[PDB]
Structure formats: C-alpha cells, structure tokens
Amino acid sequence: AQSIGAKLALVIKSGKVVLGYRSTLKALRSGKAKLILIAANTPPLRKSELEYYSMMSKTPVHHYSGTNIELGTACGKLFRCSTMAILDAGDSDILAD
Amino acid sequence: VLAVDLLNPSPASEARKHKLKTLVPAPRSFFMDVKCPGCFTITTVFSHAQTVVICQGCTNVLCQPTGGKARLTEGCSFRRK
Amino acid sequence: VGKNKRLSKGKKGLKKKVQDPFTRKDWYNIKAPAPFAVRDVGKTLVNRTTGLKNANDALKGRIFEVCLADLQKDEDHAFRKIKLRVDEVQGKNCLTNFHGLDFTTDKLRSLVRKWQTLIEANVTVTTTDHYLLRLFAIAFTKRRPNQIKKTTYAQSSQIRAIRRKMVEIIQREAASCTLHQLVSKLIPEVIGREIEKATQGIYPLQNVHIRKVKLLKQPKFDLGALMALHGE
Amino acid sequence: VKKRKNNGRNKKGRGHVKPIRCSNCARCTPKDKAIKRFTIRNMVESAAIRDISDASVFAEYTVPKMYLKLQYCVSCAIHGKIVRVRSREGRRNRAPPPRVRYNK
Amino acid sequence: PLSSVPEGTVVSNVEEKPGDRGALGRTSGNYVTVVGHNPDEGKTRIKLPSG
Amino acid sequence: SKRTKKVGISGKYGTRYGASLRKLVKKQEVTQHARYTCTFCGKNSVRRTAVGIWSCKSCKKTMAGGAYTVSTPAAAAMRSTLRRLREITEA
Amino acid sequence: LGPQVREGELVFGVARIFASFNDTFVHVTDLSGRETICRVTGGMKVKADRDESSPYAAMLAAQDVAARCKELGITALHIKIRATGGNGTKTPGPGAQSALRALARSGMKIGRIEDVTPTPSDSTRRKGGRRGRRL
RNA sequence: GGUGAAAUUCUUGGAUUUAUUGAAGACUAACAACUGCGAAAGCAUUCGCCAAGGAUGUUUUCAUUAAUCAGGAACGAAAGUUAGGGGAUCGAAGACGAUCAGAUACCGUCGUAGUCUUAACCAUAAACUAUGCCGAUUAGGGAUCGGACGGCGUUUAUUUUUGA
Ligand SMILES: [Mg+2]
Ligand SMILES: [Mg+2]
Ligand SMILES: [Mg+2]
Ligand SMILES: [Mg+2]
Ligand SMILES: [Mg+2]
Ligand SMILES: [Mg+2]
Ligand SMILES: [Mg+2]
Ligand SMILES: [Mg+2]
Ligand SMILES: [Mg+2]
Ligand SMILES: [Mg+2]
Ligand SMILES: [Mg+2]
Ligand SMILES: [Mg+2]
Ligand SMILES: [Mg+2]
Ligand SMILES: [Mg+2]
Ligand SMILES: [Mg+2]
Ligand SMILES: [Mg+2]
Ligand SMILES: [Mg+2]
Ligand SMILES: [Mg+2]
Ligand SMILES: [Mg+2]
Ligand SMILES: [Mg+2]
Ligand SMILES: [Mg+2]
Ligand SMILES: [Mg+2]
Ligand SMILES: [Zn+2]
Ligand SMILES: [Zn+2]
Ligand SMILES: [Zn+2]
C-alpha cells in the first residue's frame, strides 16, 4: 500500500480536495464526491455512519492503514485529520482502480 | 614493446578493451526495430532497456529488463538500426 | 582389583542367600509387521509371570534395533536400521509395528567430504491416521565428468531454492497416506529419486536420502488395526 | 624479525575467528592456526581380520572403517612428532609430502 | 475454562476448584502459566508465581 | 538558566536520603508525571490518576496500565505472542 | 534353561564394549537393551589398577564371557564399540580390539560391527581451562 | 574413578554399566578453504517481518557540489560496576589429596563471584599488516570470489531461452 502515498500527494497539487468531517458529509449530500478516505482510529460509530452515506450515494470508499496523525502528514498539513473527500482528480489516477 | 605506434592501434585490439579505456570513449550499445508478430508496426527499442516495453497495438510485451541487455520475446524479430 | 574394597557392603551388611536368578526366566519370539519380508527377528528374555507381577506388563514398551538388510533379505539395505515397538503379546509371541528409522554411523561419515556443499532440511507431517512424525532429508553436490575446476560449490541463493523444493515434495507425498502406506514408500527410497528429478534444473544434487524418521504422537491403540498387518 | 610471511596463521581478509579445543591438552587456539589431520582406518588391525572373517555368519564380510579428524596446538604437534623443525629455505614449501608408494 | 487453552499462555485469577470464584495469581503484575493437559481424567498442570 | 546540574526533578528532597536513593526514585518519577499520546483519539493528553489507572483528558477513555508507565515490556510482549499463536494455529 | 530351537538355527545376542583409556567394559544383553545376561570389567582380572586398560586384561575378561554365555544358549553376537564420547577422546582405547578377537577365537559367532560413540552437535565447555594441562 | 605412578571421593541403603521417558540452561560439530561480509570491535542451525549497503550494467539526471582535518561527536572484544530475571556446563577466591629439602604452584577430587539475558555505566588490548588517507606512473605469470559480453559441444527437465 506504498503507492497511495505518492498518488495522494499529486492530487493535492493538481486537483481539489476537502478535509474534515462536517465538510466531507456536506459533499456527500451533493452527490458529487468521487472518493473518501477513513483513518484507522476513527470512532467506530462515525465509521459506520460514513459508509452508510457512501452506500446511498454509491461512491467508493478507501480504508487508510494509518492513524489520523499519519493521514494529516500524508497531505502536507501540520494537523490531524480523520476523513476527507476527493471532489475531483487532477492529473493523478487514483480513481483508476 | 619499447617501440610502439600508439596513435594507430589495430581495430582488433580496440574491440577488447573497456568501453572507457580506448583512445576515445565510445558506447557499445545500439537501437533496434522490433517486429511484433501480432501487428505490422515498428517500435524503436534500446538494447539495454530498463523498463518493460509495450507495443502500441494489441498490448503485447516485447522485452524483459535484466542485468545486461534485455532479452526479447522468443517469437519476435529485430534489426539493428 | 581384589584388594581395594574398604567400606565394602557399607555401614553394616550381611551376605545373600538365594542366587542364580536365571532359573525363573522365559523366552519369547518376536514378529514383524506386514511390509517386511521375514517375520522372525530373534528372541527375548523376561521374568516368569507370577502373582503381583504380570509378564505382559514388562513386554509392552520394548523396542528393538533390526537392520533393514535382515528384514528384506538383501544386502543393499545394509546401512539403514529401524526400530520395532511391541504392542500386544499372544501366546509366546510379541507383535510389533513401525517406530522409526536411522542410518548407520559409518555410512553418514563417508558421505560428507571436503570441497562439496551439504544441504539439509526437516519438516513435520501428519498422516490420515493421526500420527505425528518428523522427516529429515540430506543431499550433496555432484561433480561433472568433464569438470576441471577443483571445487563444486553452490550459491547460497540456490541452496534456499533447493531447501524450499525439499519441503514441498515431502509434504505432498505424505499428505494423503497411512503409516502402513508410508513405510512401503520408505524402503524403495521413492522420496529421494523424486526429489532429484525436480531439483535437476537448479543443480545436479547427487546422493538424495531420507536421513531419519521419528514419530511424536500416537492415536488410540485400535487393536483391530494391529492384527490386520500381523498374522498374514 | 618476522619468521613467517603469513605469521604462521593463515588469516588475511578478516578480523576474528572462533577458537577450538586441542585434541590432546584441551587448549584454545584459533581454528586456522591448528594442525589438522584426517585419518581413515579399519575397525580392527590387519592381523585380526582373518579371525573375524571366518567367524562371521554372512559369507564374505567387509569390516567397516572409522573416520576421525584430529587437530592439535603447535606445542603438542611437534612433541608428538606430527611435524618437525625445517631449515630456513625449506620452511617455505607447502606441498604435502610424497607418501611412499613402493615401500621398498 | 482452562481446558479451552493452548499450552504456554498466561492467565490470572484461576480457580482451585470449578466454582469457587478465583484463588490463584491475583496480585499486581503476577500470573500463572499452563504447562500441559491430560485429556483423559481431565487435569491440567500449572506453574504458580512462587515456582 | 538551567537551575540544576544533575539533580533534576528530585531536587525537592534537599540533602536527605542519600545520593543513590535519590537516583532510583528520579528514574521512576520522571516517567509517571509526563504525558502520552492517546491510542484512541490521538491527542497528546493522557495522565495517571491512580497507581495503575491512566485516563484521557479529551475523549474520557480510561485504561489500566503499569504502575509508572502506560504499558510494561512484559505485557507488550504477551500481546504479540498471543496474536501470533492464535492466528496461525486456528487459521 | 535355554530357548528351545532346532539344531540348525542359532540365537543372537549383542555385546556392548565400552573401552576408555582407564578401563574396559564387556557387557552382553538380549536383542533389546532391557535384560543383562553377563558383565565383567577389566578391573576384576588385574590387581595393579594401572593395567586395568591393558589389552591382556581385556582378553581374560572377554574369555569368561563366552564361557558364561555358552550354556544360556546364545551362540552369536552383535558388536557395538564405543569410546568415552561427549567431550572425551572419541578414540577407542587399547583394549577395544583385543576383546573382539577373544570373542571370535572362543567360538562365538559375530555379525554387524558398529561404532556407537556419542558425538555432540555443539558441546558445553570442556574441562581444563584455556591453557590446558601443562604437564 | 583418576594418574608418569597414587591418594582424597562414590559404592551390595546396588555405585560404575544397559534400555525407555521427562525437565532446565548454554552452545551451533563434520561440510569449513591461503574462501565471503562489515568503518573498526565483530559476524556460522531453519523460516517470517523491518530498514540499510558494495560491485557490475546504462546514448538517464545535477554541474564542481571535492581532498584531508586542531578542538568537538557516534560506535568500541574480554575482564570489572549498578539493579531484576536465569543459574546446565566450566571455574578467580576458598577447602582438601599427592609431589617436594620447602610447594601458599604445575597434577587430581570439590567449589563462590563470574560465564548467559533485559535496562544503564566503563572506553582500555601484541585493539597488529607492529606499515595513516586521496591521486598518477612503473614487469612477467597462473589460480580464485561477484557482475557483464562472445563461442563449439555434452547434460537435462511440459525440456526451448535460462541453470550445471
Ligand atoms: Mg573489507
Ligand atoms: Mg583483533
Ligand atoms: Mg479464597
Ligand atoms: Mg586405571
Ligand atoms: Mg612441556
Ligand atoms: Mg544400576
Ligand atoms: Mg533447549
Ligand atoms: Mg562462502
Ligand atoms: Mg551446523
Ligand atoms: Mg581530534
Ligand atoms: Mg563487554
Ligand atoms: Mg561481564
Ligand atoms: Mg533491592
Ligand atoms: Mg546479577
Ligand atoms: Mg566443576
Ligand atoms: Mg589456591
Ligand atoms: Mg593504547
Ligand atoms: Mg600502535
Ligand atoms: Mg601484475
Ligand atoms: Mg585458468
Ligand atoms: Mg567470473
Ligand atoms: Mg554465456
Ligand atoms: Zn500484434
Ligand atoms: Zn595440545
Ligand atoms: Zn484520547
């Protein structure tokens, strides 16, 4: 799962993504999200709620293998992050698989 | 020995020295045109390619990288250009 | 030496009365399992059955070393010795079954030689009958007829490839077998000749052998199975 | 002065090597420094083979061999006459001695 | 129950007899180790903190 | 502006109890007053309440640990052993 | 008294000769190792205790084994020579071969010679120190 | 039993020896070499996981980013020190048996610290190739370990190309 680190860095530079929980849900209502990521140590109730929204909106979900600290530093930010959504891909190819 | 013409070595003697130790360095690699049996196209492939080369048509492998010069698929033909 | 005893019998003692304990011994015959050719393998000694001391209790945990040459009536198997453990005692007869295998000491020392490579591996396996037994394997490098180089050494990467191949073959052959079925495969050395063929590409690898086999666990006694191979 | 070019050790290209126990006095010496002899012999001496041969129950019989590898420290090596002092020029000769193949 | 346990595991608050609710190994940083089973006449060997 | 050369936290004891005894207690006091990152929420706020109780000031979780440390080497080694033993043997 | 058997057949035993550099042991058991038939050591014959390992003492000790085992009915032997082993010399003592001949000359039958010296794969530390016995 | 020869010690309260079974701690024989790897000290049973390194191959990329270093810093055998666990084997100190004119020794039977491991100190060795590091040039030869290139055959496999 070493490839996801390089793919995510490119998306930040080229495409547009939104970080956090409240903003991620608001993107799911619009139905124009393409991929959401979930950290390992997010609360289990919050995890199960997010997957249900994805099932209604039928968008793919990816389970990150690290904590919420590692997800934040994987995006160049200096703060924790638990969930995020990719509104559109840039020059990357994350949505290919 | 003790009386040699260093300016004009024989071509046979220069084909055995290291690629950098001749009178003037020169590469010993080349390019080649590979004929994929499936298609009629032509692709230029380095002799020492480090990457798996895919043909434009029908998406077939043509070479496998290795330590020295890449080995071609058995059912293929090439010419040194 | 006669004249060295100082304390002798000890603090205080007295001589004995009854001697010659061999007047109360008995002799029994020993039998062999089904696959082997000859059944009689020798005689055994024990105290006579009496009150408070049954004889059959003393003849239920003994093992014997019998060379495979004697069992098969063939001098080819002159370097392998196997053990037979007694289970049930009929009238003046002891019944036995398989309990292990081992090379002779001199054959193993003659195989190992300098300027060669020694490859060795082991793996545990269980049969359809719930027998837990372990197998050892051994092989050596083979010289080439036109070879001029002094030493024949394999690369450690190749050694691991052979070792991986050895384990896979042993597990596959012993995966679906019984103890009686497995023994019938040990004496013609089926495992060795199949290993040599598979590892041919990696390196020649002369002298493939199964060094020894010992078993770890046994199921319930199941007297019906023992009589099936015996008394044929 | 150096008495030997190799320091009488045969160790170049590494820093350390585990020692072994001498087979006579149980001394510790590096493995590369010890004198090693490999010997193959019969179980019984040549005069006794006939008595064993005709007392066997296997028609013709071949008594097995015994294989040993003895290895000594230098102090015990030249007291047991395994090796002996050589001349200054004859020291630098590592070919094994030519065993007698005619025996007069 | 101590029977449904492989050898080598550490446990705590072990019952001397089934139903007495804990007697052995119940102090800070202590445990007991199972050693082996006897499937017939079911009985288990254990090692106590004192040895 | 360091205020001490080597005494450290155990400077409140003055010149009592002997030099050696102060060193051993300092080894154990330093590790119990520090803060550790929570394993559930991720924030850096976990502090000891009782002799063997540690709780997070943010997500309010409470966990039982060592006397003066969140976990002990013996207890940590057992989880890996138990995990490795379980998954190969039964799966 | 002895095992009943036809005249053609012969019954087998095994002899375990332990020959160290200080004494020699001659021991005869049944086909398994459980039952001991006879055992005489080299020290019983000699009275000077520096000759317990002498090859002469082994011959005398081996002779009366054949006599004592003759009436039990056993007529053939297997041989298992062993040295001290372990951290020892691993070379059988001087009396190892003398006893073997005396068994053959006395009239007993012989088969399946072997060496059963115990050898370690990697041993504990050996007695003596790092400097050895300096005499 | 042990020795050049003996003694102390253990033994019919069955020693030593024989076969089967169990527990504990240490160590990895033979293969093993004028052979491999690491900055040195050092490193040898199997397999899984984790990060690192040299050489070779290259019609990839950067363009002087380099050499050696007073003070300063990381690692540094064995013995020794501070706290727990472990303690089979060997064995400083110590107690006996012989030897000797004497024997607080060499030889023999016992044996504590130590020998092993976790967390911290110590910074010395004939730490040796008694030979500092970078670069250029100077003579003949045959072996060997790692990578590449060329070639006639033999061997062999669901076999070719590869490997020996
Ligand atoms: Mg080097
Ligand atoms: Mg050194
Ligand atoms: Mg109670
Ligand atoms: Mg003696
Ligand atoms: Mg001397
Ligand atoms: Mg006894
Ligand atoms: Mg062990
Ligand atoms: Mg090597
Ligand atoms: Mg080994
Ligand atoms: Mg300096
Ligand atoms: Mg040290
Ligand atoms: Mg130490
Ligand atoms: Mg204390
Ligand atoms: Mg200690
Ligand atoms: Mg001792
Ligand atoms: Mg003293
Ligand atoms: Mg110095
Ligand atoms: Mg110096
Ligand atoms: Mg030269
Ligand atoms: Mg050559
Ligand atoms: Mg080469
Ligand atoms: Mg080639
Ligand atoms: Zn095509
Ligand atoms: Zn010596
Ligand atoms: Zn928390």
Ligand nearest to the CA of G122: 9
Do C149 and C101 contact (CB within 8 A), yes or no?
Answer: no
- Comparing CB atoms, the residue among C3, C4, C44 nearest residue G31 is C44
Contact E9 F85 (CB under 8 A): yes
Cα C155 to Cα C119, C147, C159, G48, distances in angstroms: 11, 18, 6, 59
Do G45 and G57 contact (CB within 8 A), yes or no?
Answer: yes
B76 is in an annotated binding site: no
Q: Burial-class residue F48 by CB neighbours within 10 Å (0-12, 13-18, 19+).
A: buried
Spatial CA neighbour of B23 closest among B15, B34, B36, B14? B14
To the nearest 10 degrees (0 to 180), the angle between helices G95-106 and G55-70 is 30
Do D82 and D72 contact (CB within 8 A), yes or no?
Answer: yes
Spatial CA neighbour of A15 closest among A82, A91, A70, A81? A91
What does the block give as tokens for F27? 């080894």
- As for chain F, the residues directly before each break of C–N over 2.5 Å are none
Query: DSSP 3-state helix, strand, coil percentages of chain D (rounded to 5)?
Result: 10, 20, 65
Task: Establish if D67 touches chain C: CB-CB under 8 angstroms.
Answer: yes
Full strand arrangement of the beta sheet holding G12-19:
G36-41, G24-29, G12-19, G76-82, G109-111
Q: How far is the CA of B12 from the centre of ligand 11 (A)?
A: 61
* DSSP category for residue G14: E
- Give the separation between CA F43 and CA F32, rounded to whole angstroms: 18
Chain C residues in contact with D67 by the CB 8 A cut-off are: 106, 109-110
Contact E29 F72 (CB under 8 A): yes
* DSSP category for residue D49: H
Do G72 and C22 contact (CB within 8 A), yes or no?
Answer: yes
C202 CB contacts (<8 Å, ≥6 apart)? C158, C161, C162, C165
Write the DSSP string, E1-51.
-TTSS-TT-EE-SB-SSTTS---BS-STT--EEEEEEETTTTEEEEE-TT-
The Cβ-side half-sphere exposure at A31, using a 13 Å CA radius, reads 3
Comparing alpha-carbon positions, the chain G residue that sits nearest to C65 is G32
Strand partners, C101: C82, C213
Comparing alpha-carbon positions, the chain G residue that sits nearest to C107 is G114
The Cβ-side half-sphere exposure at A66, using a 13 Å CA radius, reads 14
Spatial CA neighbour of C101 closest among C164, C46, C183? C183
Spatial CA neighbour of A39 closest among A56, A70, A64? A64
Comparing alpha-carbon positions, the chain F residue that sits nearest to E29 is F66
* Widest CA span in chain A: 34
Cα C82 to Cα C211, C212, F79, G59, distances in angstroms: 12, 9, 44, 32
Spatial CA neighbour of C174 closest among C137, C212, C133? C133
Task: Establish if E42 touches chain F: CB-CB under 8 angstroms.
Answer: no
Q: Burial-class residue B48 by CB neighbours within 10 Å (0-12, 13-18, 19+).
A: middle
Question: Which residue positions of G form the known binding site?
Answer: 22, 49, 52
- Give the separation between CA D83 and CA D37, rounded to whole angstroms: 11
What does the block give as tokens for C4? 């060295």
Do C66 and C84 contact (CB within 8 A), yes or no?
Answer: yes
Spatial CA neighbour of C153 closest among C110, C203, C108? C203
Number of C-beta neighbours around residue F67 at 10 A:
14
Task: Establish if A41 touches chain F: CB-CB under 8 angstroms.
Answer: yes
Do E46 and E14 contact (CB within 8 A), yes or no?
Answer: yes
Number of C-beta neighbours around residue C93 at 10 A:
13
C148 CB contacts (<8 Å, ≥6 apart)? none
Q: Which residues place a Cβ less than 5 A from the ion ligand 23? A: B 36, 38-39, 58
Which amino acid, residue C190?
V
- Comparing CB atoms, the residue among F67, F78, F85 nearest residue E6 is F85
Q: Which helix (H) or strand (E) holds G95?
A: helix G95-106
- Give the separation between CA D46 and CA D30, rounded to whole angstroms: 37
Q: Report the nearest residue to nucleotide H82, CA vs C1'.
A: F20
**Token match 């082993």: residue?**
G85
What does the block give as tokens for C59? 């003849």
Supply angle C-alpha F14, F16, F20, rounded to 5.
105
Comparing alpha-carbon positions, the chain F residue that sits nearest to A44 is F40
Instruction: Verify if strand H has an atom below 7 Å from the CB of C17.
Output: no
Q: How was this structure determined?
A: cryo-EM
3-state secondary structure G35-89: CEEEEEEHHHCCCCCCCCCCHHHHHHHHHHHHHHHHCCCCCEEEEEEECCCCCCC
Q: How far is the CA of C115 from the centre of ligand 21 (A)?
A: 19
B40 CB contacts (<8 Å, ≥6 apart)? none
- Give the separation between CA G45 and CA D75, rounded to whole angstroms: 38
| Nucleotide whose C1' lies closest to the alpha carbon of residue D6 | H34
Q: Which helix (H) or strand (E) holds F23?
A: helix F19-32
Beta strand pairing call for A61-63 and A35-38: parallel
Number of C-beta neighbours around residue D22 at 10 A:
24
Q: Burial-class residue G13 by CB neighbours within 10 Å (0-12, 13-18, 19+).
A: buried
- Give the separation between CA G53 and CA G127, rounded to whole angstroms: 22
- As for chain E, the residues directly before each break of C–N over 2.5 Å are none
CA of C142 to C1' of H143 (A): 22
Which sign does the torsion angle of CA C163, C167, C172, C174 carry? positive
Do A28 and A51 contact (CB within 8 A), yes or no?
Answer: no
Cα C165 to Cα C133, C161, C199, C214, distances in angstroms: 20, 6, 7, 22
Question: Which residue positions of G form the known binding site for Mg(2+)?
Answer: 22, 49, 52
Do C31 and C39 contact (CB within 8 A), yes or no?
Answer: yes
Backbone angles phi, psi at C46, to 5 degrees: -160, 160
Q: Which residues place a Cβ less than 5 A from the ion ligand 3? A: E 23
Ligand nearest to the CA of G43: 4
Which amino acid, residue C139?
A
To the nearest 10 degrees (0 to 180), the angle between helices C179-186 and C190-198 is 70
Q: How far is the CA of D16 from the centre of ligand 2 (A)?
A: 6
> What number of helices (H) and strands (E) belong to chain D?
2, 4
Chain-centroid distance of CA G112 in Å reads 14
- Give the separation between CA B75 and CA F53, rounded to whole angstroms: 71
- Give the separation between CA A6 and CA A10, rounded to whole angstroms: 7
Taking only Cα atoms into account, the Rg of chain D, rounded to an integer number of angstroms, comes to 20
Q: Which residues place a Cβ less than 5 A from the ion ligand 24? A: D 22, 24-25, 73, 76
- Resolution of the structure in the document, Å: 2.9
What does the block give as tokens for F53? 């109780």
Number of residues written out for chain E: 51
What does the block give as tokens for A84? 């995020």
User: CA-CA-CA-CA torsion for C149, C152, C153, C159, nearest 10 degrees?
Assistant: 140
Number of C-beta neighbours around residue C101 at 10 A:
21
Do C166 and C121 contact (CB within 8 A), yes or no?
Answer: yes
Spatial CA neighbour of G20 closest among G41, G3, G47? G41
Cα B31 to Cα B48, B49, E9, G61, distances in angstroms: 9, 10, 65, 89
Instruction: Verify if strand H has an atom below 7 Å from the CB of C153.
Output: yes
Whether chains B and C touch (3+ CB pairs under 8 A) is answered by no
Q: Is D28 helix (H, G, I), strand (E, B) or coil?
A: strand
Contact C44 G112 (CB under 8 A): no
If phi > 0 it is left, if psi is from -120 to 50 it is alpha, else beta; for residue C57 that is alpha
Strand partners, G19: G24
Write the DSSP string, chain C.
-GGG-SSTT-SS----S---GGGGEEEEEE---SSSS-----EEEEEPPBTTB-SGGGGSS-EEEEEHHHHHT-GGG-SEEEEEEEEEEETTEEEEEEEEEEE-HHHHHHH--SSS-EEEEEEEEE-SS--EEEEEEEEE----TT--SS-----HHHHHHHHHHHHHHHHHHTTS--HHHHHHHHTTTHHHHHHHHHTTTT------B--EEEEEE-----HHHHHHHS--
Cα C161 to Cα C79, C136, C206, G134, distances in angstroms: 29, 17, 16, 50
Beta strand pairing call for C93-103 and C25-30: parallel
Spatial CA neighbour of D34 closest among D49, D17, D56, D53? D17
- What's the N-to-C CA distance of chain B in angstroms? 39
Instruction: Verify if strand H has an atom below 7 Å from the CB of B59.
Output: no
Beta strand pairing call for G109-111 and G76-82: parallel
Do G3 and C34 contact (CB within 8 A), yes or no?
Answer: no
Q: Is D67 helix (H, G, I), strand (E, B) or coil?
A: strand
What does the block give as tokens for G45? 């014959």
Instruction: Verify if strand H has an atom below 7 Å from the CB of G124.
Output: yes
- Give the separation between CA D25 and CA D19, rounded to whole angstroms: 14
Number of C-beta neighbours around residue C219 at 10 A:
11
Do C96 and C34 contact (CB within 8 A), yes or no?
Answer: no
Task: Establish if D102 touches chain C: CB-CB under 8 angstroms.
Answer: no
User: CA-CA-CA-CA torsion for B9, B11, B17, B20, nearest 10 degrees?
Assistant: 80
| Nucleotide whose C1' lies closest to the alpha carbon of residue B31 | H59
What does the block give as tokens for A80? 């924790």
- Give the separation between CA G4 and CA G26, rounded to whole angstroms: 26
**Token match 């033993």: residue?**
F85
Do D27 and G131 contact (CB within 8 A), yes or no?
Answer: yes
- Comparing CB atoms, the residue among F52, F74, F82 nearest residue E9 is F82
Q: Burial-class residue B60 by CB neighbours within 10 Å (0-12, 13-18, 19+).
A: middle
- Give the separation between CA E30 and CA C41, rounded to whole angstroms: 57
Contact A68 F40 (CB under 8 A): no
Spatial CA neighbour of A17 closest among A97, A83, A96? A83
Cα E3 to Cα E8, E9, E20, E34, distances in angstroms: 13, 12, 17, 10
Instruction: Verify if strand H has an atom below 7 Å from the CB of C160.
Output: yes
- Give the separation between CA D56 and CA A37, rounded to whole angstroms: 84
3-state secondary structure A48-61: HHHHHHHHHHCCCE
- Strand H: positions under 7 A of a protein C-beta atom: 1-7, 10-14, 16-20, 25-38, 40-44, 46-47, 56-59, 86, 88-92, 106-108, 118, 129-130, 140, 143-150, 153-154, 156-158, 160-164
* DSSP category for residue F49: E
What does the block give as tokens for C217? 């666990």
Q: How far is the CA of C139 from the centre of ligand 4 (A)?
A: 44
Contact F85 E8 (CB under 8 A): yes
Chain D residues in contact with G133 by the CB 8 A cut-off are: 25-26
Which amino acid, residue A56?
M
**Token match 């200080």: residue?**
G22
Do C177 and C128 contact (CB within 8 A), yes or no?
Answer: yes
**Token match 């009689």: residue?**
C40
- Give the separation between CA D17 and CA G4, rounded to whole angstroms: 63
Do B52 and B65 contact (CB within 8 A), yes or no?
Answer: yes
- Smallest CA–CA distance, residue F80 to chain A, in Å, is 19
Instruction: Verify if strand H has an atom below 7 Å from the CB of C175.
Output: no
Q: Is B27 helix (H, G, I), strand (E, B) or coil?
A: coil
Strand partners, F64: F53
Task: State the chains in contact with F (3 or more Cβ–Cβ pairs under 8 Å).
Answer: A, E
| Nucleotide whose C1' lies closest to the alpha carbon of residue D94 | H34
Instruction: Verify if strand H has an atom below 7 Å from the CB of C120.
Output: yes
What does the block give as tokens for G103? 């068994």
Chain C residues in contact with G121 by the CB 8 A cut-off are: none
Q: Which residues place a Cβ less than 5 A from the ion ligand 25? A: F 38, 41, 56, 58-59
- Give the separation between CA G115 and CA C103, rounded to whole angstroms: 12
Do G77 and G109 contact (CB within 8 A), yes or no?
Answer: yes
What does the block give as tokens for C26? 């008995």
Task: Establish if D64 touches chain C: CB-CB under 8 angstroms.
Answer: yes
- Give the separation between CA G8 and CA A65, rounded to whole angstroms: 81
User: CA-CA-CA-CA torsion for C32, C37, C39, C40, nearest 10 degrees?
Assistant: -130
- Give the separation between CA C137 and CA C120, rounded to whole angstroms: 6
C162 CB contacts (<8 Å, ≥6 apart)? C119, C139, C154, C199, C202, C203, C205
Ligand nearest to the CA of G39: 6
- Give the separation between CA C215 and CA C136, rounded to whole angstroms: 12
Which amino acid, residue E28?
S
- Give the separation between CA A41 and CA B9, rounded to whole angstroms: 72
Q: Which of F38, F40, F45 should be substituted to probe chain A, the one whose Cβ sees the most A Cβ atoms within 10 Å?
A: F40
